[PDB]
Write a protein that binds this ligand. Structure first.
Ligand SMILES: [Mg+2]
Lengths: 102, 621, 587
RNA sequence: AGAGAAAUCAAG
RNA sequence: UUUGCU
């Protein structure tokens, strides 16, 4: 699967790289930039995700924590870890048997 | 007949009087698996009390009267045949432990008891992950791993698999006609049974001769190899232009320019210069793409394949002969040493501007410090500038090869200094390409600003004189045909910085370990085999020369270089062994120098490496 | 070259990493492969007898010969039947637990193999459409053909698919209806399509002066090949003399750590095998497998199943290709073998249409693990009291003897045993150091107690092209795998991170003055993620963490932006979080 | 013309 | 197809 590796630079620089489902939330033209294409899943330019990070419908904080909980656990584990100085160079069967005898 | 070490003695003795194992096929294995089941039940039942009484009650290997009494106490009844192994009071559910070769084959069976299915590898059915706890599963998995280890160690895999699962069936067969087809090109049948006594004979071998001295590589004779790389190397230069976009810089270049041919090459006729300015103008007026012109025909070999076809056909009177190819031998050219000297020339700006990572641990700090010191060492060198030029040119040219195009495309080579001033290294014009495959060679017309011109070094380049703001420059035009894959590879030519970085870091860390303290600001003397006046150099200069040589090798990488290095690693190891007063021995009829000499034909860098090898001593005492 | 020979601070072994030019483009084969394919096919026949007699050897079905015909001076192409039997028996005895694990795999794991994985293969040549196709498509059409011609439904198990192939091999005529055409095969035609191997240039192969081809089998016989290769892998992973396919770290370090009483002669022989794939006989491999299975108490049908693919390969038909190039003074014409005199005229009798029928020798990339097993069985002899590690072609042996004469006798015995099983170690590429402590194997260079692992291919430090978050995660994972594998220390690890970060930022128009940066500057959209332009947050000790979680823990991302970019309702959309940046490209 | 090395691209 | 990786 080397083709995506070589095609990325051209793919991103295309006029309408991102393929997205049609939506009304994203403005057709924001401050002179034509974000979406009206022809079908429609297409949008790479600035749409950047636009969303500034003007987008926020989901509940509880949703955010749930999605990030798995990775936040690893982050917390690492930052709570302590790194040392850097160097250069039979009874189970007994209980069952006794219980059966009882 | 003994007790397996992973089964407790009490369980073994108890099972001894539970069934007539002697009259059962594979009685020992049957008893062993039943003991495994009992031990699994015990592992489930251990240390689990519900309301002061055990949470799990074991009916396995208990008298029917007591089992029925217990079940009646719980207001449940089970048949003699379908007697569950365990009963969980907390869940008030009966369970029957089961062992199966594969968990997927297991089925719920009847509804009298939930089936706790497990495999010999310790894994449990997806349902078991609910009913049983994590500790129970871990203990059972460990015990069953030990049991499987015992099974494999005693060659009882088949017997156990039969006991737990059933009996294997004929899952494959071949008819007579397929057997006939198979037995067409071999002296044996489908199951080869050559009736010959197995025995290894004693053949008469040869003697292993010692390599007392290292071999000498073969230096080829012939014309000096010319510069055959895509772009220029040490002879790369750029025109400084006012800050702005690529179009503005190209317009500034085009406004004040008197391009006149100084040295015409018969391979790239001077007239092709018209194909450059026309593009330079076209890029200035917005559009980089441009319609063809008359000169373009000879610039990008337009309608040339058919021309050669017709010319060869018109003069092909003869008879066919096997196509024999010959690689023209060439000697070591004198410009390799000059290129190496010039590539490590100091610059003003640092040409390796990479962002730092986020230091969190002391290890991260040490790594970032090492990388920063390496960048300082090799940042201010001409080789870094040429690497940046190559990367930018390759990226800009490869970004235009993803679509079929019948018009001339212009891909300039411009890099911006930290002050914002543009730097025009040259331009690459992409002829009409209709790539249907990947490795197809697209046609390029490459114009490059050159500091100094040598006919013997650039026979196929056409050198013109450029004039900007009074300053004079040389501009070399080359008609090339380059593959897409090579362009993509050079688009990230920055990877050449890793090997010298590895060597520098290894030296620094070795010093630190010897002193137990990391002193980054250290450069020891690396003793080497040099011309003779000097017996070594500091670490920084050595790293710079390594970077220059690695860049040259990468730019001149090809089958000859690949083979030469692959077969030279052996001789490098042999030299290292000889240095340590070891002895190197070889089989009969061995000549590694032959495998190396096979790959010394044209490459100038390979010839440089071979000469360097020859310069070194070949005998150690 | 003297610049790569430091004799003060580090050793030439440490600078073995400098003898790689993999940062440059890999050579690509050009034009017809017929010359290389024919050379590969003809090499076995020349080496069968001490004096090349290709015509006499072309009539030999099984490549078995007596020890007299084994060439102890040049490459040998045959094998000794009795020696193979005894060596296989010795290997079975010495590694009995490995054979028991193989038996467990056969009894438990083999029957439950699904042929869906058969869709993970290389570009397959359709015997219906007559052209190379992706593996899933070829598998789909082959299964459909089997269903049509068998009037039954093939079970999901691999054994069921192989049995279906064996059954359809019993029909005098087979038909395939596909939209709408009806392709008809006779038994002989389908046999030819099943046994035909398709040759292809091994593009992007390093360390070789001359390009070499590889062979791929038809989708009909790929199930048996998969079964045999999986069995070989299972037996190999439990054998301490194998360097593949599992990590070579432990393999090479374990022998490097071993020492002696400073009184025995210790030697280290590093070597490769000359024309490794052009000397092995499939008959030897199937005989070794038969010995293994029989001594393991396996049933007859298992032995037949294991043997079938080797017989089919023994009756193979190699695809010649476009043809040999002939000139007419200055013209050029590719013509098939047999139309005019050439170097391979001896093989003209074996031409079958555009395919050449050969019995001896093998092609690369088909039976790698079985070939390694065959090489390994030959080392289990009384004389060879030394450690051995082999990866297909490369090998390293450690001798621990009482005198130099014993060491040389053992080395020659190793060479002669490899000849016995049909493997010739390249004399020019085999070097023995005494005392031991310096060696090379599988691109790992060992000196005393330091094993420098040198990558055979520097990682492509660029985004994979999926999307920013996935690309960043994958690149950091690659760098970490290279680092902990030993191919990159801390300094070069950080440098590789910086290079990948620069390339990744460039690929998404986040570095200079682009449309993305212009948009984010006009609208005052601060860059908070690496792909947007923010300073990198990962480090040497934090390549395994996700960017979003790591930034959130550091306060670089706020709850408002976090809820904006992680909102599942965003109209845009590996351990990366599914944020708004996990988009997909159009084409 | 050119790239290149065992023979392909230099359109289809 | 509009062009900014030291
Ligand atoms: Mg080797």
């Amino acid at each position: 699967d080397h083709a995506p590796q070589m095609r990325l630079v051209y793919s991103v620089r295309k006029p309408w790289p991102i393929s997205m489902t049609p939506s009304k939330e994203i403005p057709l033209v924001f401050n002179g930039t034509k974000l979406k294409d009206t022809i079908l899943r429609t297409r949008a330019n790479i600035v749409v995700p950047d636009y969303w990070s500034k003007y987008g419908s926020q989901t509940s904080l509880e949703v955010v924590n749930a999605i990030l909980y798995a990775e936040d656990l690893k982050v917390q584990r690492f930052f709570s870890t302590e790194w040392g100085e850097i160097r250069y160079g039979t009874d189970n069967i007994k209980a069952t048997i006794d219980s059966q005898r009882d | 007949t003994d007790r397996p070490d992973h089964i407790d003695s009490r369980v073994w003795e108890l099972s001894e009087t539970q069934e007539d194992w002697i009259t059962q096929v594979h009685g020992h294995v049957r008893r062993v698996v039943e003991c495994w089941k009992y031990t699994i039940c015990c592992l489930i039942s251990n240390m689990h009390t519900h309301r002061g009484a055990p949470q799990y009650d074991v009916f396995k290997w208990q008298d029917r009267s007591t089992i029925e009494w217990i079940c009646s106490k719980k207001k449940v009844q089970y048949p003699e045949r379908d007697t569950p192994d365990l009963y969980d009071n907390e869940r008030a559910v009966a369970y029957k432990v089961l062992l199966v070769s594969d968990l997927s084959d297991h089925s719920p069976t009847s509804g009298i008891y939930h089936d706790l299915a497990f495999n010999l590898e310790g894994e449990a059915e997806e349902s078991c992950a609910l009913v049983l706890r994590g500790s129970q599963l871990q203990d059972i998995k460990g015990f069953l791993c030990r049991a499987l280890e015992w099974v494999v160690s005693n060659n009882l895999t088949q017997e156990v698999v039969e006991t737990i699962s059933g009996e294997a069936k004929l899952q494959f067969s071949v008819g007579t006609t397929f057997r006939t087809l198979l037995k067409r090109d071999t002296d044996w049948d489908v199951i080869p049974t050559p009736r010959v006594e197995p025995n290894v004979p004693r053949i008469e071998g040869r003697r292993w001769t010692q390599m007392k001295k290292l071999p000498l590589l073969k230096e080829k004779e012939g014309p000096p190899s010319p510069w055959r790389a895509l772009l220029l190397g040490a002879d790369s230069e750029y025109i400084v232009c006012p800050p702005g976009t690529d179009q503005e810089a190209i317009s500034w270049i085009h406004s004040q320019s008197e391009i006149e041919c100084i040295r015409e090459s018969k391979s790239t006729p001077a007239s092709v210069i018209t194909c450059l300015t026309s593009s330079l103008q076209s890029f200035a007026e917005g559009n980089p793409v441009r319609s063809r012109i008359h000169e373009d025909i000879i610039a990008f070999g337009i309608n040339k394949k058919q021309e050669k076809k017709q010319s060869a056909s018109s003069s092909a009177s003869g008879e066919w002969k096997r196509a024999e190819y010959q690689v023209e031998e060439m000697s070591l050219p004198p410009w390799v040493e000059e290129e190496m000297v010039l590539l490590r020339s100091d610059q003003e700006d640092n040409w390796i501007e990479l962002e730092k990572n986020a230091i969190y641990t002391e290890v991260d700090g040490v790594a970032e410090g090492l990388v920063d010191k390496y960048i300082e060492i090799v940042g201010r060198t001409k080789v870094a500038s040429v690497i940046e030029k190559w990367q930018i040119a390759a990226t800009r040219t490869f970004s235009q090869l993803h679509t079929d195009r019948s018009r001339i495309t212009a891909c300039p080579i411009i890099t911006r200094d930290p002050s914002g001033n543009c730097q025009f290294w040259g331009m690459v014009l992409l002829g009409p390409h209709h790539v249907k495959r990947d490795t197809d060679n697209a046609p390029l017309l490459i114009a490059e600003i050159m500091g100094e011109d040598t006919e013997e070094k650039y026979p196929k380049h056409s050198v013109f004189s450029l004039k900007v703001e009074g300053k004079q420059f040389l501009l070399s035009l080359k008609i090339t045909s380059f593959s897409r894959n090579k362009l993509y590879t050079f688009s990230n030519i920055r990877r050449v910085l890793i090997q010298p970085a590895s060597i520098y870091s290894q030296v620094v860390l070795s010093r630190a370990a010897e002193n137990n303290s990391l002193n980054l600001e250290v450069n020891p003397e690396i003793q080497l085999y040099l011309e003779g006046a000097q017996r070594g150099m500091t670490l920084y200069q050595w790293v710079r020369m390594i970077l220059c040589l690695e860049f040259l090798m990468a730019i001149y990488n090809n089958p000859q270089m690949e083979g030469f290095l692959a077969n030279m690693r052996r001789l490098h190891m042999s030299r290292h062994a000889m240095m340590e007063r070891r002895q190197v021995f070889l089989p009969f009829g061995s000549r590694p120098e032959d495998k190396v000499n096979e790959c010394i034909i044209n490459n100038p860098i390979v010839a440089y490496l071979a000469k360097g090898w020859n310069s070194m001593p070949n005998v150690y005492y | 070259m003297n610049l790569f020979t430091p004799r003060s601070e580090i050793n030439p072994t440490t600078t073995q990493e400098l003898l790689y030019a993999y940062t440059g483009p890999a050579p690509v084969a050009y034009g017809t492969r017929t010359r290389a394919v024919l050379e590969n096919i003809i090499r076995p026949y020349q080496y069968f007898y001490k004096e090349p007699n290709v015509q006499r050897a072309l009539d030999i079905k099984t490549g078995c010969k007596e020890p007299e015909d084994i060439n102890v001076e040049g490459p040998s192409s045959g094998f000794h039947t009795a020696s193979v039997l005894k060596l296989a028996d010795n290997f079975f005895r010495k590694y009995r637990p490995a054979m028991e694990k193989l038996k467990y795999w056969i009894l438990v794991k083999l029957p439950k193999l699904k042929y869906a994985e058969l869709s993970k293969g290389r570009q397959t040549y359709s015997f219906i459409h007559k052209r190379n196709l992706p593996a899933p498509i070829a598998l789909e059409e082959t299964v459909e053909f089997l269903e049509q011609n068998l009037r039954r439904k093939i079970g999901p198990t691999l054994l069921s698919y192989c049995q279906a192939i064996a059954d359809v091999m019993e029909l005098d005529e087979t038909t395939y209806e596909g939209a709408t055409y009806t392709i008809k095969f006779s038994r002989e035609e389908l046999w030819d399509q099943m046994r035909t191997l398709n040759t292809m240039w091994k593009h992007l192969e390093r360390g070789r002066l001359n390009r070499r081809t590889i062979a791929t089998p038809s989708m009909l016989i790929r199930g048996f090949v998969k079964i045999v290769e999986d069995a070989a892998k299972e037996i190999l992973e439990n054998v301490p003399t194998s360097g593949v396919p599992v990590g070579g770290e432990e393999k090479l370090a374990k022998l490097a750590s071993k020492q002696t009483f400073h009184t025995a002669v210790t030697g280290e022989l590093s070597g490769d095998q000359e024309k490794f794939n052009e000397c092995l006989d499939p008959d030897a491999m199937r005989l070794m497998w038969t010995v293994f299975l029989r001594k393991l108490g396996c049933p007859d049908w298992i032995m037949e199943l294991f043997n079938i693919p080797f017989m089919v390969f023994k009756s193979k038909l190699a695809d010649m290709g476009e043809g040999l190039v002939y000139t007419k003074g200055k013209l050029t014409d590719r013509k098939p073998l047999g139309e005019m005199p050439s170097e391979f005229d001896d093989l003209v009798r074996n031409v079958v249409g555009n395919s050449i029928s050969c019995r001896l020798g093998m092609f690369m990339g088909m039976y790698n693990l079985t070939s390694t097993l065959l090489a390994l069985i030959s080392i289990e002899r009384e004389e060879l009291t030394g450690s051995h590690v082999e990866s297909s072609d490369d090998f390293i042996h450690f001798f621990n003897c009482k005198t130099h004469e014993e060491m040389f006798k053992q080395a020659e015995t190793l060479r002669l045993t490899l000849k016995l099983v049909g493997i010739n170690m390249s004399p020019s590429k085999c070097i023995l150091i005494s005392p031991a402590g310096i060696g090379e194997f599988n691109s790992k260079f060992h000196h005393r107690d330091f094993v420098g692992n040198v990558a055979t291919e520097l990682p492509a430090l660029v985004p994979n092209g999926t999307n920013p978050m996935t690309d960043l995660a994958m690149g950091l994972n690659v760098i970490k795998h290279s680092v902990n594998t030993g191919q990159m220390n801390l300094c070069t690890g950080a440098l590789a991170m910086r290079i990948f970060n620069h390339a990744y930022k460039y690929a998404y128009m986040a570095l200079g003055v682009t449309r993305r940066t212009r948009f984010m500057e006009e609208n005052a959209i601060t860059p908070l993620l690496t792909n947007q332009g923010a300073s990198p947050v990962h480090s040497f000790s934090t390549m395994h963490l996700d960017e979003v979680a790591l930034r959130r823990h550091l306060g670089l991302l706020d709850e408002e932006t976090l809820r904006r970019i992680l909102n599942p309702n965003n109209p845009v959309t590996d351990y990366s979080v599914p944020s708004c940046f996990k988009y997909t490209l159009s084409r």
